[PDB]
Amino acid sequence: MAFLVQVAADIFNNKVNFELSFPSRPSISELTRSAETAFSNEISLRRPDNVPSHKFHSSKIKMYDEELNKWVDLIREDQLTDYCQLYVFQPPNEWHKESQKEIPPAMKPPSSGQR
């Protein structure tokens, strides 16, 4: 009925995983905008009061390809499959660093940002 993608990232030293819903297979631009919005909302929610406000910026997106059993770059508009798992990197920054903490079961993304 809807096309789902799981999108994971490292936010303040926790691995987060969101289920994003689309009417059909999204474009990479559409997916990227949806993911940046969801992760920016997560940052706003989780931000420690000693950290300045900031947004999530995607730098590279990988997809775990079950056909090849490996992580590959998301480059083409015919790679995404329903309920596939993506991981989104950011450019180097002070607050969010990569970890090999396992990707948790996907949850609905935040419902809003912070007023």
Side-chain angles (χ1 to χ4, degrees):
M1 195 182 69
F3 189 101
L4 305 171
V5 183
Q6 303 176 77
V7 196
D10 284 292
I11 310 287
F12 297 117
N13 282 318
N14 295 111
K15 265 278 190 325
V16 302
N17 194 21
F18 293 140
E19 190 179 282
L20 300 189
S21 296
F22 306 87
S24 71
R25 170 178 322 201
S27 65
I28 289 167
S29 299
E30 176 185 2
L31 178 279
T32 298
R33 185 192 111 165
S34 185
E36 288 182 339
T37 293
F39 290 136
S40 290
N41 287 342
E42 181 76 357
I43 291 169
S44 204
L45 172 65
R46 306 293 177 190
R47 192 174 51 81
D49 61 21
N50 40 339
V51 163
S53 302
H54 61 276
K55 298 295 186 167
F56 182 99
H57 302 287
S58 70
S59 59
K60 176 185 292 290
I61 296 179
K62 294 193 182 182
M63 180 182 72
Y64 181 77
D65 193 321
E66 291 187 12
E67 284 289 338
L68 307 159
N69 51 263
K70 59 175 172 184
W71 290 94
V72 302
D73 282 26
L74 178 60
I75 51 162
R76 289 181 56 92
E77 306 283 358
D78 55 12
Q79 283 178 273
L80 296 174
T81 57
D82 184 78
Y83 220 73
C84 74
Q85 181 73 61
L86 306 185
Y87 182 85
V88 186
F89 292 82
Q90 299 191 82
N93 64 91
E94 310 173 47
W95 307 293
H96 312 289
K97 34 263 192 193
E98 293 78 358
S99 82
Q100 320 164 262
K101 291 182 192 174
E102 70 205 317
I103 298 174
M107 86 181 62
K108 293 316 184 175
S111 69
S112 78
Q114 304 286 304
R115 287 174 304 239

